[PDB]
Every structure is written in structure tokens, then in C-alpha cells.
Amino acid sequence: MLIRYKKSFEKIAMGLLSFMPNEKDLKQLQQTIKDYETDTDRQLFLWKEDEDIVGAIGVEKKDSEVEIRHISVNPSHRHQGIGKQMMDALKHLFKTQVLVPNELTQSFFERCQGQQD
């Protein structure tokens, strides 16, 4: 299930975001979360599997498009389709807009975009 980010989950959200190649230290991560909390165009979501929070997906709303800026799955919960599940849910949630990657999420985005349903 795709849930909205909440401050209760700041620790785990920072845990998951750290697996992104552009997030290399605690200060960078703290700034990213602050940016998600305070910029209205930037929205962070988390993925729940039963109780455990194991995925994070972060976007920027940009008129007709929604740009995926961060995507991460807890290493232990990878290779189970969660990463795609998250993007698919986000496509459903932002159905009025065009979902697009930035340079950092392009490769996994295209991999998923190339699949059959």
C-alpha cells in the first residue's frame, strides 16, 4: 500500500532514501526530507508490506507532469515487484498527469515502462 510520508516515519524514510546514488550523507538526507516536508510541489510516499515500511518514492509535481525524483526499496525486500508496484500506484494516484523520470530514476523507470502487463 502506498501511504503519504509522515514525520513519525522520518527515520525509516531517511534509511530508504540513503540507497539513492545522490544521497551520500546524513546532512544531504536531512535536507531532502525537509525539502519533501516544506515544498508543496514535492511529495514523498512510503510503501507498506503488511506492517513493515520497505519502499519510498518521492516526486515533484510540475504542471502536466509528475517527475519521480527518488525511488528506493529496502535491500531485503527487493526483486519482489515492489519497486514497480510503487510506480504503478503513483501512476494511478496522479492519473490526470504524465509520470516521468529525472536523470536519477530514468533507468529503472524505463525498465518498468518496457514491460508487458
Ligand X SMILES: CC(C)(COP(=O)(O)OP(=O)(O)OC[C@H]1O[C@@H](n2cnc3c(N)ncnc32)[C@H](O)[C@@H]1OP(=O)(O)O)[C@@H](O)C(=O)NCCC(=O)NCCS
CB of 105 to ligand X, least distance (A): 5
CB 4 within 8 A of CB 37: no
Q: Please tell me whether residue 108 binds ligand X under the rule CB under 6 A.
A: yes
Rule CB under 6 A: choose which of 53, 73, 90, 99 binds ligand X.
73
Q: Shortest approach of ligand X to residue 58 CB, angstroms?
A: 10
Among 13, 20, 66, 90, binds ligand X (CB under 6 A): 20
Q: Is 111 helix (H, G, I), strand (E, B) or coil?
A: helix
How many residues are listed for the chain in this entry?
117
Query: Position 91: which residue type?
Result: K
DSSP state, 116?
A: -
List the interface residues with Na ion, window 30-49 (CB under 5 A).
42
- By CB under 6 A, tell whether 17 contacts ligand X: no
CA dist list (Å): 8 to 24, 35, 107 = 23, 16, 31
List residues near ligand X by CB under 6 A: 19-21, 71-73, 78-84, 105, 107-108, 111
